[PDB]
UniProtKB/Swiss-Prot annotation:
Gene Ontology terms, MF aspect: toxin activity
Residue(s) carrying 4-hydroxyproline: P11
Keywords of the record: Disulfide bond, Hydroxylation, Neurotoxin, Secreted, Toxin
Protein family according to the UniProt entry: Belongs to the conotoxin T superfamily.
Free-text tissue specificity from the UniProt record: Expressed by the venom duct.
Domain free text: The cysteine framework is X (CC-CX[hydroxyPro]C).
GO CC annotation terms, alphabetical: extracellular region
Organism expressing this protein natively: Conus araneosus
Name of the protein: Chi-conotoxin-like Ar1248
Cysteine disulfide links: C3-C12, C4-C9
The keyword Disulfide bond is annotated on this UniProt entry: yes
Superkingdom classification of source: Eukaryota
Localisation: Secreted
Main location: secreted
Length: 12
């Protein structure tokens, strides 16, 4: 899973 937001993705 990967959440790309605010010009940056995080391991969500």
């Amino acid at each position: 899973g990967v959440c790309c937001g605010v010009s940056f993705c995080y391991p969500c």
